[PDB]
Design an enzyme around this catalytic site. Structure first.
Site, PDB file in Angstrom:
ATOM      1  N   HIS B 345       0.769  -1.265   0.000  1.00  0.00           N
ATOM      2  CA  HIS B 345       0.000   0.000   0.000  1.00  0.00           C
ATOM      3  C   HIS B 345       0.799   1.315   0.000  1.00  0.00           C
ATOM      4  CE1 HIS B 345      -4.117  -1.615   0.672  1.00  0.00           C
ATOM      5  NE2 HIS B 345      -3.445  -2.638   1.169  1.00  0.00           N
ATOM      6  N   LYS B 536      -8.908  13.955   4.145  1.00  0.00           N
ATOM      7  CA  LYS B 536      -7.968  12.831   4.166  1.00  0.00           C
ATOM      8  C   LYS B 536      -7.098  13.001   5.427  1.00  0.00           C
ATOM      9  CE  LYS B 536      -6.493  14.261   0.071  1.00  0.00           C
ATOM     10  NZ  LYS B 536      -6.492  12.976  -0.692  1.00  0.00           N
ATOM     11  N   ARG B 537      -6.365  11.959   5.824  1.00  0.00           N
ATOM     12  CA  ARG B 537      -5.465  12.076   6.983  1.00  0.00           C
ATOM     13  C   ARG B 537      -4.417  13.177   6.770  1.00  0.00           C
ATOM     14  NH1 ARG B 537      -5.767   7.836  11.095  1.00  0.00           N
ATOM     15  NH2 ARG B 537      -4.009   9.010  11.968  1.00  0.00           N
ATOM     16  N   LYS B 542       0.737  14.565   1.671  1.00  0.00           N
ATOM     17  CA  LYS B 542      -0.576  14.945   1.100  1.00  0.00           C
ATOM     18  C   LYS B 542      -0.677  16.458   0.863  1.00  0.00           C
ATOM     19  CE  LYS B 542      -3.025  10.961   2.557  1.00  0.00           C
ATOM     20  NZ  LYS B 542      -3.796  10.001   1.690  1.00  0.00           N
TER      21      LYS B 542
HETATM   22  C1  LIG Z   1     -11.900   7.152   1.669  1.00  0.00           C
HETATM   23  C2  LIG Z   1     -11.451   7.558   3.037  1.00  0.00           C
HETATM   24  C3  LIG Z   1     -10.097   7.785   3.271  1.00  0.00           C
HETATM   25  C4  LIG Z   1      -9.066   7.768   2.153  1.00  0.00           C
HETATM   26  O1  LIG Z   1      -9.077   8.974   1.415  1.00  0.00           O
HETATM   27  P1  LIG Z   1      -7.751   9.422   0.595  1.00  0.00           P
HETATM   28  O2  LIG Z   1      -8.012  10.845   0.187  1.00  0.00           O
HETATM   29  O3  LIG Z   1      -7.609   8.521  -0.613  1.00  0.00           O
HETATM   30  O4  LIG Z   1      -6.530   9.366   1.483  1.00  0.00           O
HETATM   31  C5  LIG Z   1      -9.717   8.226   4.539  1.00  0.00           C
HETATM   32  N1  LIG Z   1     -10.645   8.453   5.540  1.00  0.00           N
HETATM   33  C6  LIG Z   1     -11.987   8.223   5.313  1.00  0.00           C
HETATM   34  C7  LIG Z   1     -12.992   8.464   6.409  1.00  0.00           C
HETATM   35  C8  LIG Z   1     -12.400   7.769   4.056  1.00  0.00           C
HETATM   36  O5  LIG Z   1     -13.746   7.564   3.845  1.00  0.00           O
END
Ligand SMILES: *Cc1c(COP(=O)(O)O)cnc(C)c1O
Ligand SMILES: O=C(N[C@@H]1Cc2ccccc2[C@H]1O)c1cc2cc(Cl)sc2[nH]1
Ligand SMILES: O=C(N[C@@H]1Cc2ccccc2[C@H]1O)c1cc2cc(Cl)sc2[nH]1
Ligand SMILES: *Cc1c(COP(=O)(O)O)cnc(C)c1O
Lengths: 803, 803
Positions: B345, B536-537, B542
């Site tokens: 990943h 996102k985190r 990012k």
């Molecule tokens: C889909 C999802 C993620 C992943 O999002 P990315 O932008 O691809 O990192 C992280 N947290 C939640 C709550 C999600 O639904």
């Protein structure tokens, strides 16, 4: 086929089968192919539980509308046992459920054995609370039990190599159908902190919070459509990082485990936390319900204190009324005393709760301030009543002086309660004469007696349906909640059919217990022997050791004269020892060690056997007590406040060998002393020995058969591979015996000879049994509770049914 | 009134009302007078749950009879969110339940808000597992998810004084209707101990035991009557005295809490215990089910490893086959490799699991022995294939040399798996080219791609029913499990009614999100603004910081030229930072600090606002994503392996501003690059900067508007009361920025100008949106899972319904 178990109506049986199958599917997610025995137990439990709900909703609504005075029974212990059979009996569903499960190809008694005991008590005091909840519902009282939902109850006892081993009692492991969590009633409880002063008065600040989440359990009355509530509180944490989440366990440890001390004060902070945890949450609940002037508070509320364990209720109520509701001190104190009442359960000094002042200062600073103010005002009353009696002030004070200053919690309870009661006539009299003499002289009107009792639902109809049936065949079913009707049975003392039937029932019960021991432990007992039973917690004052001396006497006499006939016996002893109680643990090993010799001597064979019954608990008492011939109740006179096991044996067709101690005295009065095997020192005789000094050596020097046994214990006869194993037992008996075992040895052995003599005459043994069963009616907990209600709480009981 | 939500039949509605009322009474013990909102949520949940049971029983029976190959998806995370709405959608009950509750006087959407998220994941990897369980059921696979039932999920995030605060996520506090405990399947897991040798071989002895109790959760497929299982394990202690009972907490801490590290290896022993706990219990379960020769084991079993977290499955399977089943090593290894497959990943080195050998030696001694044997035999294969290439041996070895010797768990996974896949095309290619180049050259046939996906049930039908409906009005309902049918929508790019309807739906969603913020937080947002969203985190890679620089640019430009029209925006950023990640926490404070200036400048007013969305989680994503106009996907090229949030935005009618990174590349390929806002360095450009050395000062010296902002941050413009608050952010950007923020600043700002330019033309904005939605079909997790099934597991998917 037994009528006391109710009707198996055709539509009811059809519906029970339907709902059983529904729960197996939707609730347990199973078909009949993979369904486990536990699954089947859980399906039946939910099916029966559904029959409680309408009644539970309607009862509590009825109490709101009627608005009676409410009764709150506060206890750190509720020794409840199992719930399935009790629920079926009280709702008249037992015969219908038995037929329904039979038609499904299942044995209901097998299913019943799967339920864990709710073992949330230690012994007498905890089981009394449980019997009281049953009687209060049956008598239509608006009553609530309040306690702690321990994750682990009294430990599981295993016997390994002759010794007690302790294991955690993980009773909630598979889920508890008989509790309902109540999220909307969660409350905060406060610890530590400090006191400060505003424009308005004192304020308790900077505390640590622990949440109290309540779990409600239904308490059904006997065929009157009443269902009351037992509310038990569980501790929850409020909400680097990982350790912070793990450290939630520390607050949550407050409700983790029942302290296994039976009669002994250990003074642990965690125990003090448990006590305040129950008190704080319970009193918040009481006050909210009252609101949904405080001059009427005692007209609407009674708080009963089961021993001193919830004694902090007194300063907690004062804290709330003064600091939060802003009543003046004197008004608040009027209210507190009229609300609270205290029950005392023992006279042994090492049981007394005396908390160090420094511990209370740190954990509960505002409560210590309040206790000191209570003490000053109380001693001012004493000083006015008895001017110049300075030593009286010292004796009565809530504060005990010493290297460690402490608070006497019994003294706090008497000062803050409008009634104080002992638990049998002899005990309640001693409180007034000696133990609380000074308090009795200040306020004689406070002191009462309420002799203990047991519920005849659990302790006759449930455990001994065969006996309940033969009684009902002669006098109908009214006795089940009117136990004094058993006196009608005296009219059958010469009735051939009743004599036959009483002995038949006892023998069936003995066969069933023998089959339990073979099934569960591969232990064989002689079915044509007298079943001689001592079951209760292991303690020096209860004198399991005196029983030991007698068993060894029977063995030695057989070896001396092998050809002489003796009545065969199976001597059974059981009960748990407190994990830290070395002597009690040594006494269990002694019992098993005697058996290792006696049970394998070919000269003895099946004429004598001695066995230790593992893991004595409520469900096991329901099995062994109906099978007993002889009930051992042999505490040193003056030491057992009441007893209740004694009552259970009397109700179930055993004869009693005992001292004139506790409720034994009232049992003998009820039946006639000619129908009891009474022996040994009375209280007056014990006191005379104390005045001159107890010298065990005198008894050893004068009694040849006693010397033989002591030498057997000393020399290693009962511990060949470790000759000195029992040196500490011998040393205590010879030089440090507070309970005078040797002084009752000769009368005990002679009394036991008379027991065997009567057992040789089956007809006259049974006739004496009838005279016991027939006069056990006084010992119903219904009688006890009616007395509490009328003489302390100010409410009138009622056996009228709800629609 | 929306047809995609199903039929509200008259008998069905009547029955749902009946069963709702039944559960309120028997299950919650309530009447309508005292029933709480939570009670009503719980009644509806049980009512809906009952509809799963028959299907769940019949599905698992069908798998026994059909005996297909079974698929086991092993993960330390399942990021499931809420279950009520999903269950109704998949069973076609949504419109019936809505009508039933309406007729009872209740709003079903209010009830839905009471359910806690099952937040048992961190981000992308955990949510992928959850989407995969949904797709495997919908495609009729005999599949099982296996993980840990954490008592506490990902922490609850509060924002206080502009800073992240963490609170425990006590998700099980009120009970979880959607799990079924399974007592009969409890198993022992072993820790510590030592290895010894008998007549038969190695033996693992003297271990400490922790019990694993499984809890099963149903996983419904989309209107095909299939219900699969997610099995999560919970830790239980086996069974002076009091402390011994309290110390049960230590073993039980294994399942206490999810580690909140997103992409970062911390090396804690407790985390290693969690990993082995899942692996040991799961593999016991798999082997028992297989038995109910091992040559056929890989024909009947597939084990998929979600990252290296369950990598111990490889040596655990070898341990069981060799030590317990007594297979020869070579046979056992054949079986293991054919059973196991590994998904990778991320490429960031600090995420890689490399466990110290001493830690493994102590906790899992037999597993370390097995790992060393695996390593010797694997390197012998390398040595034979590439004779004399000594550095290759060093690079490929499972053992990493150093001051602390470690095991590389990725290397272990490749050696013990028959397939290794990345999560998007660009990522899977880099694995072969660079990161696992040596492994690719030894075994090229092992390496695969499986581009990530998202379920169109949760991520369209559930969260955006309005959009699902207007699509269904034109092309029917088949697309819901055949998402490539969305390409039919390209035929409506010039259709006036569809253009109208797409924009209408977006505006309704924006109004609903605005109303959520006002209701729950009393925050007002401008409804006639472009909703610009980055969720996102929080991570440096990012580049939430790049977004920050742009927001400050918009502010400074307004202040320079107040009279110039600009497209109004609401800039929304949300996500959680790892508790120990200082820079991520500083970045959250920066976002709120910008808002404290921008949102209160009267020259700006409602032309620009920047807000931090608290507690981003699955249920919140379902709310905000359907309301978004612009999707921010701005990671440094080469750093985001795939992404899945990107896919969710595309499906729900937002346009994307992003780099050519991860799945962004394939999204642009699918829609046409003319329909995406692509900017910045490509991977090739990042690599060229690395070769010469990244000098941030060059960009500062050449870009006036950038200097302005850095000086604002340095001097204290955004932290007046603590001027040096953001010194560490400035220092990292100027001297230690591994992610080259300054290097993409100019292209990013210019790309954003083009976004605003298109937003000024509503018709053409909407037409580009249609071209995005219509080409999002590739990103269905159904497509992803069909590829796993055919190319790795060797099973054929089926959307056929069960009776
Ligand atoms: C889909 C999802 C993620 C992943 O999002 P990315 O932008 O691809 O990192 C992280 N947290 C939640 C709550 C999600 O639904
Ligand atoms: O525990 C009970 N109900 C639970 C409510 C609830 C909430 C979430 C998930 C499952 C469950 C039920 O098991 C319960 C009903 C009754 C009826 C009684 Cl009488 S005692 C009792 N407990
Ligand atoms: O938790 C469930 N049932 C419990 C079994 C059980 C045992 C003792 C006390 C209470 C309970 C029920 O709440 C349950 C049923 C179903 C049906 C599903 Cl589908 S998921 C699910 N959990
Ligand atoms: C009744 C009971 C007790 C009390 O018995 P006593 O002999 O009066 O001490 C203790 N334990 C259990 C399980 C009981 O049922």
């Amino acid at each position: 086929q037994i009528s006391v178990r109710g009707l198996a109506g055709v539509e009811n049986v059809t519906e029970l089968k339907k709902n059983f199958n529904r729960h197996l599917h939707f609730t347990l997610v199973k078909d009949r192919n993979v369904a486990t025995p536990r699954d089947y137990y859980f399906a039946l439990a939910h099916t029966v539980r559904d029959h409680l709900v309408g009644r539970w909703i309607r009862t509590q609504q009825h109490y709101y509308e009627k608005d009676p005075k409410r009764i709150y029974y506060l206890s750190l212990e509720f020794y409840m046992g199992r719930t399935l059979q009790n629920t079926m009996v009280n709702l008249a569903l037992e015969n219908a459920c038995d037929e329904a499960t039979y038609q499904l190809g299942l044995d209901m008694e097998e299913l019943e054995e799967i339920e864990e005991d709710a073992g949330l008590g230690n012994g007498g005091l905890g089981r009394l609370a449980a019997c009281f909840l049953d009687s209060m519902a049956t008598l239509g009282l608006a009553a609530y039990g309040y306690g702690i939902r321990y994750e682990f109850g009294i430990f599981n006892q295993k016997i390994c190599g002759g010794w007690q081993m302790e294991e955690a009692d993980d009773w909630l492991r598979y889920g508890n159908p008989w509790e309902k969590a109540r999220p909307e009633f969660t409350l905060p409880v406060h610890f530590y902190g400090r006191v400060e002063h505003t424009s308005q008065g004192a304020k308790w600040v900077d505390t640590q919070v622990v949440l109290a989440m309540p779990y409600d359990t239904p308490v059904p009355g006997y065929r009157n459509n009443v269902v009351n509530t037992m509310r038990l509180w569980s501790a929850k944490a409020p909400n680097g990082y990982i350790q912070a989440v793990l450290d939630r366990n520390l607050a949550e440890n407050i409700s983790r485990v029942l302290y296994p001390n039976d009669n002994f004060f250990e003074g642990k902070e965690l125990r003090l936390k448990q006590e305040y945890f129950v008190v704080a949450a319970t009193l918040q609940d009481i006050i909210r319900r009252f609101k949904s002037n405080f001059d009427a508070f005692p007209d609407k509320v009674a708080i009963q204190l089961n021993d001193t364990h919830p004694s902090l209720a007194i300063p907690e109520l004062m804290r709330v009324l003064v600091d939060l509701e802003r009543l003046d001190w004197d008004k608040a104190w009027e209210v507190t005393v009229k609300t609270c009442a205290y029950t005392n359960h023992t006279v042994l000094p090492e049981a007394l709760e005396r908390w160090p002042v420094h511990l209370l200062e740190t954990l509960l600073p505002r409560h210590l301030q309040i206790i000191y103010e209570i003490n000053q005002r109380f001693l001012n009353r004493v000083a006015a009543a008895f001017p110049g009696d300075v030593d009286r002030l010292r004796r009565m004070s809530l504060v005990e002086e010493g290297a460690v200053k402490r608070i006497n919690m019994a003294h706090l309870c008497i000062a803050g309660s409008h009634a104080v009661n002992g638990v049998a006539r002899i005990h309640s009299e001693i409180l007034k004469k000696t133990i609380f003499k000074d308090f009795y002289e200040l306020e004689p009107h406070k002191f009462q007696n309420k002799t203990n009792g047991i519920t005849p639902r659990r302790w006759l109809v449930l455990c001994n349906p065969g006996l309940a049936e033969i009684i009902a065949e002669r006098i109908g079913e009214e006795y089940i909640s009117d136990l004094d009707q058993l006196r009608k049975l005296l009219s059958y003392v010469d009735d051939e059919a009743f004599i036959r039937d009483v002995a038949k029932v006892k023998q069936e019960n003995k066969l069933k217990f023998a089959a339990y021991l073979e099934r569960e432990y591969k232990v064989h007992i002689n079915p044509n022997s007298l079943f001689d039973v001592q079951v209760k917690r292991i303690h020096e004052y209860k004198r399991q050791l005196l029983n030991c001396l007698h068993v060894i006497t029977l063995y030695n006499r057989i070896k001396k004269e092998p050809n002489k006939f003796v009545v065969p016996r199976t001597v059974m002893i059981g009960g748990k020892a407190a994990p830290g109680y070395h002597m009690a643990k040594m006494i269990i090993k002694l019992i098993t060690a005697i058996g290792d010799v006696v049970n394998h001597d070919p000269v003895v064979g099946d004429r004598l056997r001695v066995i230790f019954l593992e893991n004595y608990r409520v469900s096991l008492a329901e099995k062994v007590i109906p099978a007993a011939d002889l009930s051992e109740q042999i505490s040193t006179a003056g030491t057992e406040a009441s007893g209740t096991g004694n009552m259970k044996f009397m109700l179930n067709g055993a004869l009693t060998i005992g001292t004139m101690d506790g409720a034994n005295v009232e049992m003998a009065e009820e039946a006639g002393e000619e129908n009891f095997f009474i022996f040994g020192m009375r209280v007056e005789d014990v006191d005379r020995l104390d005045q001159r000094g107890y010298n065990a050596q005198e008894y050893y020097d004068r009694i040849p058969e006693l010397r033989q046994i002591i030498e057997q214990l000393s020399s290693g006869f009962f511990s060949p591979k470790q000759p000195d194993l029992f040196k500490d037992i011998v040393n205590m008996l010879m030089h440090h015996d507070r309970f005078k075992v040797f002084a009752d040895y000769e009368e005990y052995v002679k009394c036991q000879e008379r027991v065997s003599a009567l057992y040789k005459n089956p007809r006259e043994w049974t006739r004496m049994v009838i005279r016991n069963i027939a006069t056990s009616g006084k010992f119903s907990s219904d009688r006890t509770i009616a007395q509490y209600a009328r003489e302390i709480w100010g409410v009138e009981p009622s056996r009228q049914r709800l629609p």
